[PDB]
Design a protein around this motif. Sequence first.
Motif, PDB file in Angstrom:
ATOM      1  N   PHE A   1     -28.697  -4.087  -3.195  1.00  0.00           N
ATOM      2  CA  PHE A   1     -29.143  -2.700  -3.065  1.00  0.00           C
ATOM      3  C   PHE A   1     -28.421  -1.792  -4.052  1.00  0.00           C
ATOM      4  CE2 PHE A   1     -31.608  -3.004   0.845  1.00  0.00           C
ATOM      5  CZ  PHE A   1     -31.108  -4.149   1.440  1.00  0.00           C
ATOM      6  N   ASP A   2     -27.113  -2.004  -4.196  1.00  0.00           N
ATOM      7  CA  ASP A   2     -26.262  -1.153  -5.027  1.00  0.00           C
ATOM      8  C   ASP A   2     -26.405  -1.538  -6.496  1.00  0.00           C
ATOM      9  OD1 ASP A   2     -24.280   0.604  -5.959  1.00  0.00           O
ATOM     10  OD2 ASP A   2     -22.656  -0.807  -5.475  1.00  0.00           O
ATOM     11  N   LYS A   3     -27.570  -1.257  -7.068  1.00  0.00           N
ATOM     12  CA  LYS A   3     -27.894  -1.726  -8.415  1.00  0.00           C
ATOM     13  C   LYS A   3     -26.957  -1.240  -9.529  1.00  0.00           C
ATOM     14  CE  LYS A   3     -32.208  -3.185  -6.909  1.00  0.00           C
ATOM     15  NZ  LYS A   3     -32.074  -4.669  -6.916  1.00  0.00           N
ATOM     16  N   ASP A   4     -26.420  -0.027  -9.416  1.00  0.00           N
ATOM     17  CA  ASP A   4     -25.507   0.462 -10.455  1.00  0.00           C
ATOM     18  C   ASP A   4     -24.052   0.060 -10.211  1.00  0.00           C
ATOM     19  OD1 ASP A   4     -24.787   2.241  -8.419  1.00  0.00           O
ATOM     20  OD2 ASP A   4     -25.310   4.050  -9.548  1.00  0.00           O
ATOM     21  N   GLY A   5     -23.815  -0.666  -9.122  1.00  0.00           N
ATOM     22  CA  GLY A   5     -22.486  -1.158  -8.807  1.00  0.00           C
ATOM     23  C   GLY A   5     -21.444  -0.073  -8.612  1.00  0.00           C
ATOM     24  N   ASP A   6     -21.862   1.089  -8.116  1.00  0.00           N
ATOM     25  CA  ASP A   6     -20.919   2.191  -7.926  1.00  0.00           C
ATOM     26  C   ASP A   6     -20.349   2.252  -6.504  1.00  0.00           C
ATOM     27  OD1 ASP A   6     -22.903   3.428  -6.374  1.00  0.00           O
ATOM     28  OD2 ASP A   6     -22.540   5.400  -7.269  1.00  0.00           O
ATOM     29  N   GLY A   7     -20.606   1.217  -5.706  1.00  0.00           N
ATOM     30  CA  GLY A   7     -20.021   1.111  -4.378  1.00  0.00           C
ATOM     31  C   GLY A   7     -20.732   1.825  -3.238  1.00  0.00           C
ATOM     32  N   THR A   8     -21.929   2.350  -3.491  1.00  0.00           N
ATOM     33  CA  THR A   8     -22.702   2.991  -2.424  1.00  0.00           C
ATOM     34  C   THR A   8     -24.210   2.945  -2.691  1.00  0.00           C
ATOM     35  OG1 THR A   8     -22.673   4.884  -0.875  1.00  0.00           O
ATOM     36  CG2 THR A   8     -22.768   5.398  -3.253  1.00  0.00           C
ATOM     37  N   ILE A   9     -24.997   2.930  -1.619  1.00  0.00           N
ATOM     38  CA  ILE A   9     -26.449   2.854  -1.741  1.00  0.00           C
ATOM     39  C   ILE A   9     -27.085   4.233  -1.567  1.00  0.00           C
ATOM     40  CG2 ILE A   9     -28.571   1.839  -0.825  1.00  0.00           C
ATOM     41  CD1 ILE A   9     -26.654  -0.416   0.362  1.00  0.00           C
ATOM     42  N   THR A  10     -27.833   4.667  -2.576  1.00  0.00           N
ATOM     43  CA  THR A  10     -28.531   5.951  -2.540  1.00  0.00           C
ATOM     44  C   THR A  10     -29.976   5.761  -2.079  1.00  0.00           C
ATOM     45  OG1 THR A  10     -29.270   5.700  -4.822  1.00  0.00           O
ATOM     46  CG2 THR A  10     -27.166   6.824  -4.460  1.00  0.00           C
TER      47      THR A  10
ATOM     48  N   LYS B   1     -32.569   6.426  -3.932  1.00  0.00           N
ATOM     49  CA  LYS B   1     -33.244   5.859  -5.092  1.00  0.00           C
ATOM     50  C   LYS B   1     -33.115   4.337  -5.099  1.00  0.00           C
ATOM     51  CE  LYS B   1     -31.690   5.233  -9.770  1.00  0.00           C
ATOM     52  NZ  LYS B   1     -30.582   4.506  -9.066  1.00  0.00           N
ATOM     53  N   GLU B   2     -31.923   3.855  -4.762  1.00  0.00           N
ATOM     54  CA  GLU B   2     -31.653   2.425  -4.757  1.00  0.00           C
ATOM     55  C   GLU B   2     -32.368   1.706  -3.613  1.00  0.00           C
ATOM     56  OE1 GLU B   2     -27.360   2.642  -5.006  1.00  0.00           O
ATOM     57  OE2 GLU B   2     -27.363   1.922  -7.074  1.00  0.00           O
ATOM     58  N   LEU B   3     -32.365   2.295  -2.421  1.00  0.00           N
ATOM     59  CA  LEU B   3     -33.106   1.701  -1.313  1.00  0.00           C
ATOM     60  C   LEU B   3     -34.596   1.702  -1.647  1.00  0.00           C
ATOM     61  CD1 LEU B   3     -33.363   0.526   1.537  1.00  0.00           C
ATOM     62  CD2 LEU B   3     -33.333   2.875   2.430  1.00  0.00           C
TER      63      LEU B   3
HETATM   64 CA   LIG Z   1     -25.194   2.683  -6.033  1.00  0.00          CA
END
Ligand SMILES: [Ca+2]
Lengths: 393, 393
Positions: free
Chosen positions: B266-275, B277-279
Amino acid sequence: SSRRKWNKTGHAVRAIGRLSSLENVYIKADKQKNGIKANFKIRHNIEDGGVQLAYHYQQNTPIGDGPVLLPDNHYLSVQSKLSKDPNEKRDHMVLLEFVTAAGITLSKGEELFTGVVPILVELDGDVNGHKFSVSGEGEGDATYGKLTLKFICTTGKLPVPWPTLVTTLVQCFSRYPDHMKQHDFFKSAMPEGYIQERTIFFKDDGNYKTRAEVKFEGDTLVNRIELKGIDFKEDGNILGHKLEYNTRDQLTEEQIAEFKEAFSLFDKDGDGTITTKELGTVMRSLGQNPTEAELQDMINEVDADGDGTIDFPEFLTMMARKMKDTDSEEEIREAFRVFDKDGNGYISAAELRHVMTNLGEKLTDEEVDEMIREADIDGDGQVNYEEFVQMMT
Amino acid sequence: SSRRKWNKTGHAVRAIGRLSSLENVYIKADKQKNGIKANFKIRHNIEDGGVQLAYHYQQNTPIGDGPVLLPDNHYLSVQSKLSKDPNEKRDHMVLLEFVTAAGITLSKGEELFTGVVPILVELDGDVNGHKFSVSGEGEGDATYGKLTLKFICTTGKLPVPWPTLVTTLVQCFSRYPDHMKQHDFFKSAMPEGYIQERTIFFKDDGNYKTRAEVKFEGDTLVNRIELKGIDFKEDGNILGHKLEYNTRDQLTEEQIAEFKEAFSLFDKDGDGTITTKELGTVMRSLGQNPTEAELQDMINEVDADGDGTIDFPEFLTMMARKMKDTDSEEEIREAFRVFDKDGNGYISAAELRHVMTNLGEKLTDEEVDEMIREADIDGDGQVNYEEFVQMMT
Ligand SMILES: [Ca+2]
Ligand SMILES: [Ca+2]
Ligand SMILES: [Ca+2]
Ligand SMILES: [Ca+2]
Ligand SMILES: [Ca+2]
Ligand SMILES: [Ca+2]
Ligand SMILES: [Ca+2]
Ligand SMILES: [Ca+2]
């Protein structure tokens, strides 16, 4: 490894289901009709497994011409419990419900709901040509978002399952928190009331269309409904009565009432929520004096909607929390030490009354004695730790 | 009735304990020392029941003279798991930790922590005159607030229990969410580092006083500590080694790693959280197209700090959720239907790879075949529902 790949792919797919599983009732203004609209879905458990989905579409408009409140987008969180009356021969449903508005972050109508309000519900239905009626009565206490009702099928056997009629059979009894008072359309339309219309689509099956008038008749809040269902399958989950009645399991009415009584000890002004001042007052009464910032931190760690207070459904979630068996036992140890003020290992009658009166109960010595007597296994006139454990277990 | 009075008074007293049970690490600016202060308490489970309290008082100040960030009041939420290495003969502790900042609602240093960072820890201790040393090594991934370390007592038998040394033995690896970046003192002091001082009071027993230097030495983050304990009781819980090692139980390292892998999908940008946009991207990949508002509602229903995103500890809480056996089974049914795109009751190799590649994995057909082979009990080359259940169970 393949099992690892399976496990992680599984989690991801299951996460989608849990992330996307909207269970709340979503409300939006419908300014063109001077009212509101809502949509939500209900998941009806099918006997022996599976779910029957019921897609709800709702609109409400005032009956009167007085100005009403049109809300920003928000939702209602509903906890419902269905049960039966063992003394009831008629086809019936007993219902307990807590409903709380949320989703937004930090007059004549409101006043009508500050106390307990009697409720009457009447429904005339036609599903696939099958004529039926339902009558219900009970009470609403919007302070806690609480409803308690009993419904009877007055035409004999109900041709559809009770759970499918729950949403149709009084959202004016929802608890709206202080910062959302200007968003409570339902109360604002009172006493004159509102019209509530729904279409409810049962997937792979027929649909209900409902029209209801919700208004005060004297001091009673009345919900009068007409329901019509069409396109239902003879041996579908509805007409074939294949839906579960109640959910397994549920903390029961009696336990909830105990927690509510406990809640009232904190909620000194009876406004349906616990503030930092109120928790402080209770803790001060038992000898603890945390600061305002500490109390705010305390409430925050168990505050779910970030509003800075603990409402009754939040209180319930806190107390229904799982607890490791070791944590549970230590919690009971800590509770014992609270009662046992002099630390001698025995709760006296004097210590019991000191605790209860400080919490805000008004017991006579004779009532305290009876509580002691209830727990006092060895008859020494006090409650030791082992006796306390049994009583709490 | 007396039992009712007992039950409700009990709940109230237990509620006080749960409401007042501050477990988080509370951080406040200490502007006069150009740093921060913190206080918190640790509850150490005593073998055969009871808790040993350890009251922590902490202060940190920069080593260098470069400007640092002084935060508004906030806290850290810590989940720790202690374990052992079966292949290790030395007295040792294996540690897995997730740490996340929160409590506040909606540069050179930060960059140093965007990836996985190697860690070295050294401690020289003196407790009641008993000299000992501990060395540790591992990695930090501040993106998920994650630490993984192994510690060794290099002087033989540790004269105190491992759990009492956890807090002493790198808060720069805490995850600070985007809206709290200006409140991360720990990273802002890097690479030059900070001094961390504590006094830790063990109730009814002695105290530790610690001084540590936390800084980069090359590309490694190093925590060098001196600890001194005094006033400890010979057969107290500390010197008498009467504390539990690990908590019962805990979802284990392997399961967490599976959930983390799932989280990464889910965390496609690997920034440690799911937005949202990502879901949305993930759901769109599997054929579902919810609106932005719907995605926001979806995330909200499982968002704990109201920040509008799902971080890894939030993801874990969502997935570790209890689930009624009936809900669990229906969830698995729904997952099956996700994999079984054509609805024929069988997951083919083509359907499995379509699902995994869309989630964002890069499997060869041969890897997909092996997954099928793993679950394919009856050898027809596909995974039926019963086979799917076993694999998920
Ligand atoms: Ca993310
Ligand atoms: Ca109150
Ligand atoms: Ca709240
Ligand atoms: Ca006593
Ligand atoms: Ca006794
Ligand atoms: Ca969040
Ligand atoms: Ca298929
Ligand atoms: Ca097969």
